[PDB]
Amino acid sequence: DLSIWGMYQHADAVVKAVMIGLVLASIVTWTILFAKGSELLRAKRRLRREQLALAEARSLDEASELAQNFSPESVSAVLLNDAQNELELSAESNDNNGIKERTGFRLERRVAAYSRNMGRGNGFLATIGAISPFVGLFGTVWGIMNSFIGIAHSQTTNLAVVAPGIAEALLATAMGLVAAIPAVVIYNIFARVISGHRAQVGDVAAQVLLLQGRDLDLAATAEAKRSQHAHQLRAG
Amino acid sequence: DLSIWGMYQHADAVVKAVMIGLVLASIVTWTILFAKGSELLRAKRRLRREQLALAEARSLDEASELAQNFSPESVSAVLLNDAQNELELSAESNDNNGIKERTGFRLERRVAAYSRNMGRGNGFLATIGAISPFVGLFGTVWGIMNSFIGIAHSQTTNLAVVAPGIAEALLATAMGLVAAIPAVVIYNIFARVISGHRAQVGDVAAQVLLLQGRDLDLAATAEAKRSQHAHQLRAG
Amino acid sequence: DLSIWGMYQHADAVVKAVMIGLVLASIVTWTILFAKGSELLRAKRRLRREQLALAEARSLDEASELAQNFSPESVSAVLLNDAQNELELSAESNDNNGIKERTGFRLERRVAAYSRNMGRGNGFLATIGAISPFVGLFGTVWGIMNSFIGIAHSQTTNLAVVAPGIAEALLATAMGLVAAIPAVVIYNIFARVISGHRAQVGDVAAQVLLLQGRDLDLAATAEAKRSQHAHQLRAG
Amino acid sequence: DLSIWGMYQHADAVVKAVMIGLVLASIVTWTILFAKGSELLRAKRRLRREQLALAEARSLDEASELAQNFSPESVSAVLLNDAQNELELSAESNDNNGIKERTGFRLERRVAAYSRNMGRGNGFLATIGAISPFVGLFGTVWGIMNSFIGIAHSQTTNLAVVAPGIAEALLATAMGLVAAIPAVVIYNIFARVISGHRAQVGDVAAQVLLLQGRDLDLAATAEAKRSQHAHQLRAG
Amino acid sequence: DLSIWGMYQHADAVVKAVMIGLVLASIVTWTILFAKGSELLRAKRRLRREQLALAEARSLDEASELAQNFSPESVSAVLLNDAQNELELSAESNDNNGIKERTGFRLERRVAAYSRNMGRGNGFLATIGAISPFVGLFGTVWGIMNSFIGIAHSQTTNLAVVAPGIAEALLATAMGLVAAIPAVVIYNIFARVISGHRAQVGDVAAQVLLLQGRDLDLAATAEAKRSQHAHQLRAG
């Protein structure tokens, strides 16, 4: 009558509350894994295809033309629209260093927002893996405390009577560790994957800033080369 | 006579001091939650309305006109007044890169001050969730130490006499964990929410710096275009 | 004979050394509090008065005139002398962006030095609150180890003889926690206050950099406006 | 029958699963050491030879000529090709500050990628050294819990029967510490070595940015000196 | 026969290996202290003398003349040679902002290298203070595990026989704490001192960058003032 289910239904009210809290923490842990690791791996494999497509680009217009047929909910099309949007909001503004600083500002704001939305379940995983051995420890401290209350109320010296109480308490601490260890492991995996992915988003943003800077620079050079002849037709 | 209230009033002076200290830590924990989480959520929903209002702005003057009817104790009106204030303190100063660097300096100072005032109760929550299992542990170490003193003073070997002492001690450590676990959980929640909100404040500050930079840039361009005709009337 | 003083004088040599080490850690903890929290609060209330005085300044010369009557060992007068000192070391240097970058460099060096001298006792508080439960744990491990040596040397089975040994050991671990918990609490308080104060010092430094930048900018503008007439009298 | 192998085969199903999980964590620990510490030391000794070769360089063309005969899978040739590649992508772009900012951008992206690929096994080592005492602790908690279930099912008071159960449990926690301690030690070693190596990669990148900046600067100076004679033939 | 040396020679093979590993960790701890704290304090007192000598400098040439008679293995002479070396490598390069950015780049690379070579033993101290209570804990877990094996092999119920086993185990954990606590204390001391010293090296580097920037600025100004007369003799 002392199986893993046997011990749970033979437990106290507070110990059962601790145990179903730890089981719900485990359900949330594995659900965060199978429902956001799937989205993370899908987004990694999507940005890899977009990164390989835009890796042959030589201007921002070729990158926008290659990004016309990307996914609707992508990243590279969002960053390319920010760069191009800034180029049209700052049209009839001749300060190209301004456009570069403002685009770098919008893209680091956008990359920061994207990377923040990536790690949503990380707070849950960090809190579960941090507090779950304490919730299991509270379960076993309450179990042993009720065992000592049961040994003080009734003058009973032997341990074969108070042993299922100690076993239920220890079950609560074991379940605490079972809810804790995938929390930390999955958190670590996610941290690695998310850093990989935020390096990819930073790489695509880098690419957009280098294609916009190179275009602005080359355009400014051609314009200068044509305007020198006008300068020497005006100052003469 | 050994209920949760029964054990407290049957405890020592130091153990009762530990227990009411942990209960006051729990009262402060839940009061920080229900009285600053309310202010944080109110400020989040207020900056969201102001962010949606100013998201259609094309200059700093349209943003100031849309922000004239904002809340008195807002953020977006404060940041917009810093930007506009700098524009009038640095009137008759032709260095526009200067105004942009000084406004970015004032706004990062203001955003830093606002974000510092946001996390006020965080020090309390971090200290309570860090030291509360130690205060519970001091309570149980003193409980077992007084139990061993009671077992050394009177030659009493059985455990049915010294068991309420050990139970009171264990109550102190359980209460330590109950004061500890919402401290860490609420700290984590608050950290997430506060990062969300400090990203929103950073976004509004970003917007103000991009509307002021774009205006200064466009103005400098128009002024330059008009002064070229004066240049060719002066240098001829 | 087993009071808190009774147990100490009835202890071993190593256990008494652990206990007076923990009492000296507690004396240092409360002395760091009452002798540097007083200096921190005095400096906070002094920089608040200087911040309110200089908040009505419109140039660096008005700020220096208002800071002539400040405290000798202040901060705002030191930072204002750095700014003004740089303005006279870089006299007959026409590069104003140079003066701004060099002043920002000296002031961040000075602010860093001031903020480093602020947190002096923080290393003591962090080390005491980190190692003090370990020193208490070493005391109780040596106490129980000597208790087991005493139970192995003399074939004595009952616990009413070996109980004051275990109580002295547990006293060492309780004293470890008492020396540990104000170390962490006071460290946290100090960290908060010191961040508050280093934000104030950063605000005053910010003010000095914005008053020096605005003055240099406005001066450069007036000089340019006067030199344009000389330019058009020279190039004609 | 209670040797280290004797205890394992006499254990439970969950305790044996814990033990082979800890042995596989130890195999992965020592394999990460002997198969990536070898690659790290090989890469350190290779970048040292390339650093000594390029330390006598005075331009980017001499560094490229000395790097023609480097290893195929090197670092210095990759960074030198980025610098030279940027110099040819931004050919017919006269903004040299642009080329310097874009090269610094590509090289910090490349250095970041290289340093990220260096620390691959670090996530494994950090997770193993963090969760391995907990997996050993889960093993011993399950061992003692099954021991108490065995002492509650059969009314058996003496400890000479339940002692191999407690010994198997303790074996699981010792094995937990054995899988944990080389995880942290090797992680620390690797962290040191990887910081050493990422300082070397940062030094080579620094060198490439200083050779490209000095060349661009010196070229711009010579070009300016020749164009001054053309200026006085155009403005005359 | 149960003195501190008595217990060690009466121990197991694994427990003696744990104990001599902890004694060698203690020897390394105190040797890192007395052989690198001496070098740190010598370097602190040497940079203080050089800082007081160069604090009266008004150019980089006066600082080089005052640094000609410094120690051979110093810091200030190294940083001053970097600044002067850059000034001669970038001779016949008129871009002074270039020289300032490249010198700041070399000096932050050099300061980073010096500060990295300062904290050599820090990895040893951090690893010893982190893993040493675990190595002591492995020693006591193996000691109690062998005690339970000895109580399971021979049906022996009393504790006066198994007590030296538990005492040897506890000795291993006490020695673990003795090797651990100076590791953390000395690490903390070193961290403080090294931050003090890396602030001094940063201050000297700051000084070198401010003396080189001021010299370049003042030179550029004088050159401009002389070249204006040539400009008005050329453009006339």
Residue numbers in the entry:
A (entry chain E), B (entry chain A), C (entry chain B), D (entry chain D), E (entry chain C): 46 to 281
What did the publication describing this PDB structure actually write?
ExbB and ExbD are cytoplasmic membrane proteins that associate with TonB to convey the energy of the proton-motive force to outer membrane receptors in Gram-negative bacteria for iron uptake. The opportunistic pathogen Serratia marcescens (Sm) possesses both TonB and a heme-specific TonB paralog, HasB. ExbBSm has a long periplasmic extension absent in other bacteria such as E. coli (Ec). We purified ExbBSm alone and ExbBDSm and determined their structures by single-particle cryo-EM at 3.1 and 3.96 Å resolution, respectively.
The 3D class average model clearly showed a pentameric structure. It was refined and polished to obtain a resolution of 3.1 Å using the Fourier shell correlation (FSC) gold-standard criterion at 0.143. The periplasmic N-terminal extension did not yield any visible density, precluding its structure determination. At the C-terminus of each monomer, however, density was clearly defined, allowing structure determination for an additional 10 residues in a helical conformation up to the last one (helix α8 finishing with Gly 283) before the His-tag that is present but disordered. The cryo-EM density of ExbBSm shows vents located at the interface of adjacent monomers and at the height of the cytoplasmic junction with the inner membrane leaflet. These vents may allow solvent or ion passage. Additional density was also clearly observed on the external surface, and we attributed it to the phospholipids present in the preparation. Each ExbB monomer appears to be associated with the equivalent of two PG molecules, located at the inner leaflet of the cytoplasmic membrane. However, we were able to model only one PG molecule per monomer with confidence.
